[PDB]
Structures are given as structure tokens and as C-alpha cells.
Design a protein around this ligand. Structure first.
Ligand SMILES: Nc1ncnc2c1ncn2[C@@H]1O[C@H](COP(=O)(O)OP(=O)(O)OP(=O)(O)O)[C@@H](O)[C@H]1O
Ligand SMILES: Nc1ncnc2c1ncn2[C@@H]1O[C@H](COP(=O)(O)OP(=O)(O)OP(=O)(O)O)[C@@H](O)[C@H]1O
Ligand SMILES: [Mg+2]
Ligand SMILES: [Mg+2]
Length: 861
């Protein structure tokens, strides 16, 4: 027995001129799914009929065993190719599976019969579980098709009803060839359930299975030995393996030459045969016969139903998951005229649904309820990338007047690439602490504004507000839907604990007023229990721990460790985050160049008002911007705070004294002239008078008025001015028997109040301090008309806190200001230790409102 060509057994004279029309002709009931595989001893061809026993013979399913060198690989090629040359893709589809990296089905791709070639599963082991659901889904799909089409019971009933005289789609029988199923089950033994289900359903569903392995052990065929009708035994490894698949050890004794084997079915005798080949040439009195055949058959017939889809390797882009994007008129670069534009929906990635034999785009409904977005994942998992997609995705479906973004980049500084977007208004890095506080303060203010205004106007919900601005006839707040983005929440609740509770309350009531938070961190446990529950839309990636997950502990573990972008959809499915690109390139190494081009496209397509910036404390605040005397009253504005950028006042009718510390050239003398000038504009010389102690002579600009009483530039002139004002205020001291009314009205004395303005107190606080005698009057300064306004340098200020004058001023809780300095001096006033501050800036300390960062005003001349 030499070796014969398959073209010979199929009665084909000319292989180089195949006609698919005369190959896929309607075959008789017996010849259906019946092809020759080789010749027997006598010389008669041996046919394999994989039809059910009730229709033909050798049952629906079968098994093939053959050790290395038995031609197991070549046999499987011959069987498939023969079936392909005898049937149309209309009536037959293949699922070719090899557990190990075998090139058995290499070249089968061209055939329209082949739905999927699943090779090499020993490596990416979880693919087995996917392949389970992909096939399990096919079983259910075929069944529901038979339940729906009519109420048929089997494919055969369906098929010829269809071909009898009916209108139905062709439903081809499915042939599944799984190689090395033995070492597959020894890897994932739970997979055997699929096999059993096939043996239970496959006959009616038209699904035929062929289990092939290099070597077998008897345990593997548990609950399968019955369903496997025909058995092809090539040269086995042991005598027992030959037995468990045939009943006799005859396969062990087969010649080492490949091609020889036996064929057992039911109770009918073995038939030794010799398989034909397809991997050779043909002669006459290079290239294989396989290639020649496939080359001609490829491209003919209906393309098969996809059972297996590309298993989540290369990430998609935003243009890939969205309709064609075009520069619209007064709508920017967006999906012009799309139904889902400006619906607060955003596409993020691609979800894998293998059971449903499809892959869905992942969409988020930030239109309320789930408007808050949370992201978690271990180091280098793909967070910072995820955020950039979500922002860009929203940026593509919305105009900068509809959405705004304010970011706190605490995870890599990658967000700075989107800073030129018209949708963003601020991108604060970890080094810009001033902008970080303001970014949160700005949104906090907007929330409070919308909290009141929405009730004042006829606005019942944020949906209405969005609908009002949509008319293009309403301005509102100047904002739309605002998104506060934090890259690393952990970093935030460490360096800025105060902002944790701040942003938390933003989330607790912001969704109803169009304020969204988009927070990201490493672990869900890094989010406090109070705020973690507020994140409606959670986007979970690969975690450092599969537990602590917010979807499924189990599933979380199956998420690829070192494959960035992979995650777990809320429904419990694997997905892959898209890339923030609209170019089309899906390569992560050229991401930087990609993002920059996307932002460039969106910005240049938008020719309107951009996102409102985060306003901050001015480097220089003009005193003219402060409320006038006719506005404030007797109160004197000195600057604005960081909290709400609102004026900060000093009311000398409530607290009589004021004290300010600060290093050299910080703004002491300027603040002193500012406060003084405020007194001039609000008091008449018969209401309040001034006395200056200015050794450095910095206060000449404000000592020219009629209020001026005494000006001292020397220690002698200073202490001289103390003697006469001491005895003066001593005269105003309350008589013992005064009624409470007389006390609070200050009736027993008349005249003006005295404002003692002292600049450079460190230079006047020598061994013999001129201000010392007045120390005993400072507590009684309220019952009289005394006021102390003192400025002192930073050096040795901490130890000066114990001086009689200052120690009593601080004791009676006088308003104070701590400007630029160092921490060596310790806490001077309030609860904040001094540090390097820009000119004019300081920490305003008041008994009420406590400590507050403010910016003092600059007064020229
Ligand atoms: N969906 C994706 N597809 C392909 N590559 C990705 C994807 N997501 C992230 N990457 C790659 O992973 C790298 C890290 O991304 P990213 O900075 O988002 O992770 P991270 O968790 O924020 O890192 P870190 O924890 O250090 O801040 C990037 O260089 C990017 O190229
Ligand atoms: N409120 C302010 N805002 C911005 N800049 C200011 C303010 N006040 C002062 N400056 C700047 O600081 C510089 C010094 O101001 P000022 O004379 O108040 O310092 P000082 O407290 O008197 O220090 P020194 O006692 O060492 O002179 C000035 O050149 C001025 O431009
Ligand atoms: Mg990061
Ligand atoms: Mg000064």
C-alpha cells in the first residue's frame, strides 16, 4: 500500500481546474457528510460518515488517537479538506481547535467554511474558558433559532423544511475539530461539561464533534465514551490506549510509517486503512496539493457566522467607537447631527461578550444618578490613560459650553496634555498648591450659587437647566456640566486632608446641580466608605488584589496582570479601554503624538467661548478694588481671602486691636498705611485721632492729616508721647459705680478715639521699651478709646509672644495676620505655622472664622 492522493479518491481528473459549482452539488442522503479518507486492505476506499445513526451511520461524534509520527495531523487536514471539497459553506461550517501550538490547520483561513481557527491555548490558558462560552453560546443560539424559526426539534427537520418549499436562512451543520483534548482536560477539567452537552444536543442542533489527541488515558472519556460513535485509531503509544479506543491493542503494532490506522464503529469489525495525503504534489509522465485546492475554493460561498471573535489584544480608538467626526457649525469637532450628541453619554472602551458572540462598545450614562465616576487599579494599570479617554470622549460629543473640566493631576502629570482643550479650564500639578485649593474652591462656590439660584429661577432639575441653555437663549451661571477630576485620590487625602471632606460634599449633592466628580486611586479601600458609595459609575481595572474588588472577586483575578487597559465592566465582563485618539493609530508608543493632534483638532474646530478659568489670589491686589468707605461703613477692608475671594474686614468697634507679623519686605508697612488710610476715610478728627511710632519713617504718606497728633522717629520722642497719652487714657478709666448702660455707651467721657500705629515693633521693643507703660491699659481699651495697631518683623517673633504688650494683645483674642516667615519661630497666631509666602499674602486670624488665608491690598505712594 503506497500513498494515494485525495484528488484520486474524489474522482477529480484535473486538480488545477476545480469548479465549486460541480463540487458542492446536492448529494444523496447517504453521501451527505460522507467522504473517503483512504483505502482499505482490498483496495476499496474507506468512507467516513459523520451523520447520526438514524440517518446514515457512525453517529454524530467521534474520536481519533494517534501518537507522534502516526500522521494524526495529516489525517485531520485530509478529512476537513475533503468535506470542504464536497460541501458548500452554505451547508457546512468548521471550528478548528488545537490546544497546543500545532500548525494542523495552517492555511485553512481562506476557506469560507472555516468560522474560526483557534490555535495555541496552552499558553493563554483563560482563552479555554472563553472558548467554552463561545461554543456554549452557539449551542443556545442554534436552539433558540429552532424554537423561533418554527418550533422544530432538530436541524434536519429545520433544514429540509427550509429546502422542501419554505423561506428560511441556511443553517449549516457545525463540525468541531478539537486536537489535543486530552492535555486540555488535564489543564481545565471543567471543560468536559461542554463535551457532554454536545453529545446531548449536537445531534439535533447539527453540531458534530471530533476529539483528537496525541495520547489518551481512560479516565478522560468519562461520560463521553457513549456519545463517541466512530473511533479512528492510528499508531498508539501503548497497548492499553489502543484498547480503550478500539478494544484491541492492534494499533500498537501498526508500522512506524505514517498513514496506517483502524476504524471501529459499533459492533462491526475493525477496518485497517491507509490515509490519503494532501500535502504533496501531483505528477505527469513545487507546491502542495493542499495549497492548490484552497487557492481555488477561497472566496466562494457565503461567509460563515462568527463563533469566535478576536480576543481583546489591540485597543480601539475613539474614532473607531464613534460615528464620523466633522467640524460642525457652532458645535465644534463632533458627530454632527447625531442623536447621541450632548446626551451626557460617553464611550470608553470595548466590552467582550463571548457568550453572545459579539463585542460591545462601553457606554456610560452620566446624565444623572451615575454621574459620578470612580476609577481604581494598581500601579501602571492604565488609570491616567482612562481619565484622558473619558475627558476626550465627552469633549467629542459636547461643546465647551456644555461641559467643563478641572483637573488635579496626582497620577503622572499626563493630564497636562489636554490642557489646551477648550473644554478644560485648569490643570493643576502637585507642585501648584495654590491652584489646587482654588480649583476646589471655585467649584464649591458654583455649587452654592446653583443651590440658591435654581430655586429662585424656575429650574426644577439639572435636566431643565441643560434644556434652557440648549435653546441658546439662556446664560445661567456661565457653566454647564462641570467635572472635577482627581488622578490620585490617595495623594489628595494626604497632602490636602482639608480637601477630602470638601470634594466629598461636592459629590454628596453636586449631581442634582450638574457638578460631577471623577476620582481615581489605586485601591477602592483608599476611598473612604462615605465617598466611595457616591461614585455611581465605577470603572475597575486590574487591582493589586482580586479581593477588595467592587464587581466580582473571582472575575477580578482573571483580569490580565501585565496588560494595561484591561478591566471589569459593571455587569461583570472583561473590557479594554480605548485610546484618546482620533487618528486611527492603535499603538501605545505613539500615544503622545496622537493626543496632541486630537486636542489640536478640537480646539481649532471651536470658535466660541472656552471653559471658564479658575480665578486665584492676585499677585498684586489694588486697594481700589476694595469696597469704598460709603459701602463698608466703619469696617475697613484689608484684602480678600482664598476661600471665596470675598473682602476681609477689620471692625474696630468689636475688637480694638490688631497685630501683624512678617519677614523683611513682605508688606508690613504697606498694610499699615492701608489700614491707616481706611481710618481717615471713615472717621473725622473729632471721632478718631492718630499717633505714629515709625523709626524707619515709612508712614509719612499717611501722617499728614488733621487726625495726626504725635509722630515719633526716635526713642526719646516715642516715650514722651507715651507719658501724656497714658495719663490721658487713665482719665477715661471707668468710675467704680457705673451702671451697665453707662459702661456700654461710654457716657462718662467724651472726645475722639485714639489709634496708636506702631511700625517695626522689634526696633521699639528694646531693653527699655517705650510702649511698656500702656500694657496695663490694653485690657481696659474697650471701655476707653484706645486702639493698638502693631507690625513686627519675623526674627525672634516667637519669643516675643511673651512680652507684656504682645502677650496681652494675643490673650484678648485680637485679630491678627501672619505673613511670610519661617517655621523656626513656631506658631505665632492661629493654627498655622509660618512659612515662605509671596508679598502681601498672609494668614488672617480672627476669633470667629478662625485662621484664613488672605491677600492684602497694595496701596501706591
Ligand atoms: N487601553 C490601553 N491600551 C494600550 N496601552 C495602554 C492602555 N492603557 C494604558 N496603557 C499604557 O500603560 C501605560 C501607563 O498608563 P497609565 O499612566 O494610565 O497607568 P497608571 O496606572 O496611571 O500609572 P501610575 O499608576 O504610575 O500613575 C501608558 O504608557 C500606556 O501606553
Ligand atoms: N499688599 C501687597 N501686595 C503686593 N505687593 C506688595 C504689597 N505690599 C507691599 N508689596 C511689595 O513689597 C515691597 C516692600 O513692601 P513694604 O515696604 O510693605 O515691606 P516692609 O514690610 O516695609 O518690609 P521692610 O520693613 O523690610 O521695609 C514693595 O516693593 C511692594 O511692591
Ligand atoms: Mg497615574
Ligand atoms: Mg517695613
Amino acid at each position: 500500500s503506497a500513498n494515494m492522493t485525495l484528488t484520486s479518491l474524489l474522482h477529480i481528473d484535473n486538480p488545477y481546474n476545480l469548479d465549486p459549482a460541480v463540487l458542492w452539488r446536492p448529494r444523496p442522503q447517504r453521501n451527505r457528510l460522507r467522504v473517503p479518507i483512504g483505502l482499505d486492505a482490498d483496495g476499496r476506499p474507506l468512507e467516513l460518515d459523520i451523520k447520526e445513526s438514524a440517518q446514515g451511520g457512525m453517529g454524530p461524534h467521534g474520536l481519533c488517537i494517534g501518537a507522534t509520527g502516526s500522521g494524526k495531523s495529516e489525517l485531520l487536514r485530509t478529512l476537513v479538506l475533503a468535506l470542504a471539497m464536497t460541501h458548500s459553506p452554505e451547508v457546512l461550517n468548521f471550528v478548528l481547535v488545537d490546544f497546543k501550538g500545532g500548525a494542523t490547520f495552517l492555511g485553512m483561513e481562506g476557506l469560507r467554511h472555516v468560522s474560526a481557527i483557534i490555535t495555541n491555548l496552552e499558553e493563554e490558558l483563560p482563552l479555554v474558558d472563553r472558548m467554552y462560552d463561545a461554543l456554549h453560546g452557539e449551542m443556545v443560539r442554534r436552539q433558540e433559532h429552532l424554537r423561533h424559526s418554527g418550533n422544530y426539534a432538530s436541524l434536519r427537520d429545520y433544514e429540509k423544511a427550509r429546502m422542501e418549499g419554505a423561506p428560511l436562512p441556511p443553517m449549516p451543520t457545525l463540525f468541531i475539530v478539537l486536537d489535543e483534548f486530552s492535555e486540555l482536560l488535564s489543564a481545565k477539567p471543567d471543560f468536559a461539561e461542554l463535551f457532554v452537552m454536545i453529545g446531548r444536543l449536537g445531534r439535533s442542533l447539527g453540531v458534530h464533534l471530533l476529539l483528537a489527541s496525541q495520547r489518551l488515558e481512560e479516565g478522560k472519556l468519562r461520560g463521553l465514551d457513549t456519545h463517541l460513535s466512530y473511533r479512528i485509531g492510528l499508531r498508539t503509544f501503548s497497548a492499553m490506549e489502543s484498547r480503550v479506543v478500539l478494544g484491541v491493542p492492534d494499533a500498537y503494532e501498526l508500522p512506524p510509517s505514517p498513514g496506517n490506522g483502524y476504524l471501529k464503529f459499533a459492533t462491526e469489525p475493525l477496518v485497517r486503512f491507509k490515509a490519503a495525503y494532501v500535502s504533496g504534489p501531483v505528477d505527469e509522465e513545487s507546491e502542495s496539493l493542499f495549497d492548490v485546492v484552497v487557492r481555488q475554493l477561497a472566496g466562494h460561498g457565503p461567509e460563515p457566522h462568527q463563533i469566535w471573535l478576536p480576543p481583546l489584544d489591540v485597543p480601539p480608538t475613539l474614532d473607531e467607537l464613534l460615528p464620523p467626526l466633522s467640524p460642525s457649525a457652532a458645535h465644534g469637532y463632533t458627530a454632527d447631527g447625531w442623536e447621541w450628541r450632548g446626551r451626557l453619554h460617553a464611550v470608553v472602551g470595548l466590552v467582550d461578550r463571548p457568550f453572545d458572540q459579539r463585542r460591545d462598545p462601553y457606554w456610560l450614562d452620566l446624565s444623572g444618578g451615575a454621574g459620578h465616576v470612580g476609577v481604581a487599579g494598581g500601579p501602571q494599570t492604565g488609570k491616567s490613560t482612562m481619565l484622558r479617554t473619558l475627558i476626550t470622549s465627552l469633549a467629542l460629543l459636547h461643546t465647551p459650553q456644555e461641559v467643563q473640566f478641572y483637573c488635579l493631576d496626582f497620577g503622572g502629570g499626563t493630564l497636562a496634555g489636554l490642557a489646551e482643550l477648550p473644554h478644560v479650564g485648569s490643570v493643576a500639578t502637585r507642585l501648584d498648591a495654590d491652584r489646587i485649593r482654588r480649583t476646589v474652591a471655585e467649584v464649591s462656590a458654583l455649587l452654592e450659587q446653583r443651590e440658591q439660584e435654581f430655586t429662585e429661577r424656575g429650574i426644577d432639575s439639572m435636566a431643565t437647566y441643560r434644556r434652557l441653555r440648549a435653546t441658546g437663549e439662556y446664560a445661567g451661571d456661565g457653566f454647564g456640566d462641570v467635572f472635577l477630576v482627581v488622578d490620585n485620590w490617595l495623594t489628595l487625602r494626604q497632602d490636602y486632608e482639608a480637601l477630602e471632606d470638601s470634594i466629598t460634599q461636592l459629590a454628596a449633592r453636586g449631581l442634582g446641580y450638574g457638578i460631577h466628580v471623577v476620582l481615581s486611586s489605586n485601591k477602592w479601600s483608599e476611598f473612604r466608605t462615605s465617598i466611595r458609595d457616591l461614585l455611581g459609575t465605577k470603572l475597575e481595572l486590574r487591582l493589586g488584589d482580586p479581593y477588595e474588588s467592587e464587581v466580582d472577586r473571582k472575575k477580578a483575578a482573571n483580569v490580565p496582570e501585565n496588560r494595561p487597559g484591561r478591566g471589569l465592566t459593571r455587569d461583570g465582563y472583561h473590557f479594554l479601554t480605548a485610546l484618546p485618539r482620533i487618528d486611527g493609530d492603535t499603538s501605545a508608543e505613539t500615544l503622545t503624538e496622537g493626543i496632541a493632534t486630537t486636542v489640536k483638532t478640537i480646539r481649532e474646530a471651536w470658535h466660541g467661548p472656552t471653559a471658564p478659568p479658575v480665578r486665584m489670589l492676585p499677585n498684586v491686589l489694588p486697594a481700589a478694588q476694595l469696597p469704598s468707605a460709603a459701602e463698608s461703613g466703619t469696617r475697613i477692608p484689608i484684602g480678600i481671602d482664598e476661600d471665596s475671594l470675598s473682602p476681609v474686614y477689620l471692625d474696630f468697634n468689636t475688637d480694638p486691636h490688631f497685630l501683624v507679623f512678617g519677614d523683611t519686605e513682605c508688606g508690613k508697612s504697606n498694610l499699615l498705611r492701608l489700614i491707616t488710610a481706611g481710618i481717615i476715610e471713615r472717621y473725622t478728627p473729632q471721632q478718631a485721632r492718630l499717633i505714629f511710632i515709625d523709626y524707619s519713617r515709612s508712614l509719612l504718606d499717611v501722617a499728614t492729616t488733621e487726625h495726626q497728633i504725635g509722630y515719633a522717629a526716635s526713642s526719646t520722642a516715642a516715650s514722651s508721647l507715651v507719658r501724656d497719652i497714658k495719663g490721658a487714657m487713665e482719665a477715661r478709666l471707668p468710675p467704680p459705680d457705673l451702671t451697665p448702660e453707662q459702661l456700654r455707651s461710654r457716657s462718662w467721657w467724651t472726645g475722639a478715639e485714639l489709634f496708636l500705629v506702631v511700625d517695626d515693633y522689634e526696633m521699639v521693643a528694646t531693653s527699655d521699651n517705650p510702649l511698656r507703660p500702656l500694657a496695663e491699659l490694653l485690657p481696659q481699651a474697650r471701655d476707653i478709646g484706645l486702639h493698638l495697631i502693631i507690625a513686627r518683623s519675623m526674627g525672634g517673633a516667637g519669643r516675643a509672644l511673651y512680652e507684656p504688650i504682645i502677650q496681652r494683645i494675643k490673650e484678648m483674642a485680637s485679630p491678627g495676620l501672619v505673613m511670610s516667615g519661617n517655621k523656626d519661630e513656631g506658631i505665632l497666631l492661629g493654627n498655622v505655622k509660618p512659612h515662605k509666602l509671596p508679598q502681601g499674602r498672609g494668614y488672617f486670624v480672627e476669633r470667629r472664622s478662625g485662621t484664613r488665608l488672605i491677600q492684602t491690598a497694595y496701596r501706591e505712594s
